[PDB]
Amino acid sequence: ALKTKEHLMLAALETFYRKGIARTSLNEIAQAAGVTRGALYWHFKNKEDLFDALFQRICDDIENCIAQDAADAEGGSWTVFRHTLLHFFERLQSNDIHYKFHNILFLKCEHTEQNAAVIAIARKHQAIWREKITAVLTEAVENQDLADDLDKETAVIFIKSTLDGLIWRWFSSGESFDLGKTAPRIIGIMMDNLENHPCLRR
Amino acid sequence: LKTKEHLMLAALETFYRKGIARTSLNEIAQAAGVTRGALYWHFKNKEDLFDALFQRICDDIENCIAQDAADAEGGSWTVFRHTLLHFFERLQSNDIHYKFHNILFLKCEHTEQNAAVIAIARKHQAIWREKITAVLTEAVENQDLADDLDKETAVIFIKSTLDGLIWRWFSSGESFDLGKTAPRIIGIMMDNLENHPCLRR
DNA sequence: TTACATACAACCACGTATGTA
């Protein structure tokens, strides 16, 4: 019977991805899941609770692969950081669930205060990235991989901005360019800038 | 036109503070000084109001980008740096341009059924593709950038760099000083186009 | 005729109550 709930959340993701969330009625999710609105209201209080339960689960799974890809990675924290970033963008192509998650967060939702769950998922995703980037940066200067006078506060903004822009451009372009070729270049330039550009120094 | 200008600016603020989908034309009307009869007179529906409001603003954005470059303070690539710097100063000081980008980033759904949103996004992107491409060709015909620069990747690299700064600044709730951050991130971006070998072919 | 305000009719989505197995 729990298959019905997982069907609903995946039907929610698919419908959220093709119509945006606001234009998605609970009836449309139910029809896409081959069920009725009674099924949804049974498992979920409303559309907000369905979006939150769906995007809390996916956001946790994203945090897990970034953690799992790093723990199974040999080398220094700064070497596996490139490793974790490349796999993140590979999942954007190959992992449909993670792909739709990010695409919905960037393009097909309104980040405004009345959409409480959207603002909550966005901050959760950003706090995850802030946590990973911050810890990687401290470890990378404790190993001379980056200079000990690195402007690390500016570095987190620089890193997250660079990656958000690639994700945004890729989505907003309608995937007009090859993420598999572009992301390695943009990440390498980003990491080269953190090693050698003087403006990322204090 | 005084009523029509009130409506579009009231639409701009209401679109900004509540998002577009959650914005009834009733709320726009009472956020303005009028009723829905005023809106349906000047506009066919919410999409026609959003398009007229956002075609006019996006044109004004394209005009300041052009006006500050036509006030050529130096070479084509030297002027390009300042067109970008003036663009991010406008995002702080110009409340209309600020909302426009804020509404066209975190306050709207880029989905096919919202025809005018997709159309304005395409326009705004085509604006930047034209400016960036023309700047890049003039900058290699002046040796400011190398003759083997990956021009196709350069536009993606430039627009991604700028969209990410705008996205991050908005998404963080303006957590950081863009007056200080954008010059740094622009300069690193422009230094990368001069000297990074991966922006070469 | 314009330039609106008000009135009217309709639907769409929602939440809940209820049937049911």
Place this chain on the structure above:
DNA sequence: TACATACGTGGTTGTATGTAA
């Protein structure tokens, strides 16, 4: 329980109508 169906409601929309420029 785990749904499907039925019911009642409001919010938004679009249009019709009124009315003073």
